[PDB]
Amino acid sequence: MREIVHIQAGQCGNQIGAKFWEVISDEHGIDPTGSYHGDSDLQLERINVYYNEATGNKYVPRAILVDLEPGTMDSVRSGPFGQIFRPDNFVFGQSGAGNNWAKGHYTEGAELVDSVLDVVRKESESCDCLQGFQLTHSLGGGTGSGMGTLLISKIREEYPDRIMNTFSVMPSPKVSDTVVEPYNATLSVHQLVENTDETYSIDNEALYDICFRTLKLTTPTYGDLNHLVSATMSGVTTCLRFPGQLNADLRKLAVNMVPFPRLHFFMPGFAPLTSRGSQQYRALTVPELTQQMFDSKNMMAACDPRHGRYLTVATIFRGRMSMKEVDEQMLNIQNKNSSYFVEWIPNNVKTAVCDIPPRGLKMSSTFIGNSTAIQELFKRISEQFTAMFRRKAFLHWYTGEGMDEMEFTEAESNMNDLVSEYQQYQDATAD
């Protein structure tokens, strides 16, 4: 379990993916040319997980950049770390998906898919011990959503024994690029329930609320939202990127986090919450870091964790702090809040402490929860889907691509069954 192959699909997928690559490169001491300039060996110990060692020196991300549109691909190349990527790894079509899942999944997407598979196969064939795949995409668009889930299915068929992991961004009317987001999201969730092993549910609703209410923004931009995402992505991947005992690989993480195959939708959390211009604050102790675990305000999914129960939790602390203090502050939270942890999964909260803090922060905490409260996210998408579907609004753009109404009914039925399944475990006593 060494190499991970990273895939970026569509606008959102590529914007958040670019941001992830620039954040982790800084943490691993890699400059925008691919050369290592760091002052530590922990930075290079597990460099192989995300980077390939190039022809003499230099480190190149094992990333595949995908879009049905050339624009975003130009925007990345022109970005801060744009030149670090393998040029042959940029796979782009010429005609977009028109914000239509059916075009990304069946038409335009299906026409570009084999070119993407060819680039992923070259990266995969090069691996000594492939862990699996990490996909960044939105669920509201056409490419990231439709083509992204098509890629998941095609990758699953060729690599059935590898782990499929996604960073999936959920749409919100508060920050939307298109009228049909509830359709594209519902059709995608159906795919993710069946085809992924682990999904980080990144909700634009939660990201907006944090920027507006907590960061006191006013009118937040994708840049503001993506700053929370990059911090979350860096936090949740810490255990994969640095030496450690806990959830050190994709399969070991899934074994600790997923008690039932379909219940693999994680609610990520993060502390401290900061804005791009907010730099310099100094504060936050071990108890303060742990207190955010149950804090709804620190969740990257618009769910209140106190509305459900935790099946499993992975907690990662970054910076120079006492493991003694962390262990007891984590034990206290569990005892004080025992009603939000299922009793039938003993010792269900795992803690890890990494010495390297993220840039800007002296101390931080990242939470990965498999909570029954995630049903609130799915209920929200389901209600928005139903308001449109009841009237068959915009349906002709999907049926025009050869889709049947039945696919819509099946997708929503599957999403409602998932909601019922979280509810079942939320109510389970054991006892």
């Binding site: 038409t107 299915s153 068929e157 059935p160 050869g402 889709m403 049947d404």
Partner: protein, 136 residues
């Protein structure tokens, strides 16, 4: 105040003995077979591998079914488009021909009325000829 010391062994790097505080209240000492087999082990390991292989093939069969459906919707969109074309082509030709038919009919009816006016004229001309010359 009692204790029984029974010497056991004495070697270069050690000495051993037994201490008995009380004899067993009850007497008569403490009052395996598998073996297993390589064939049995292999049989179970192989049965487990076949369960693992059956399920991997089942997932693959399901993924293959989604692939067939993907070809079907692409095919459905092709068929709906061809039909659209077909209908539009026949709806138009029926319209262009019906319009040709009505237009030629209208021009024939009017040319026939002008022609009848000509017949009536030589007929009028015949009448004058019978009135003129005769008696004159």
């Amino acid at each position: 105040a009692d204790m029984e010391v029974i010497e056991l062994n004495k070697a270069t790097s050690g000495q051993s003995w037994e201490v008995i505080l009380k004899p067993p209240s009850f007497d008569g000492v403490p009052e395996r077979r598998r073996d297993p087999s390589l064939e049995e082990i292999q049989k179970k390991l192989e049965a487990a591998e076949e369960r693992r292989k059956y399920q991997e093939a089942e997932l693959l069969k399901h993924l293959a079914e989604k692939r067939e459906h993907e070809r079907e919707v692409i095919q459905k969109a092709i068929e709906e488009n061809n039909n659209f074309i077909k209908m539009a082509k026949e709806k138009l030709a029926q319209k262009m021909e019906s319009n040709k038919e009505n237009r030629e009919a209208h021009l024939a009816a009017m040319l026939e009325r002008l022609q009848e006016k000509d017949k009536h004229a030589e007929e009028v001309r015949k009448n004058k000829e019978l009135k003129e010359e005769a008696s004159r």
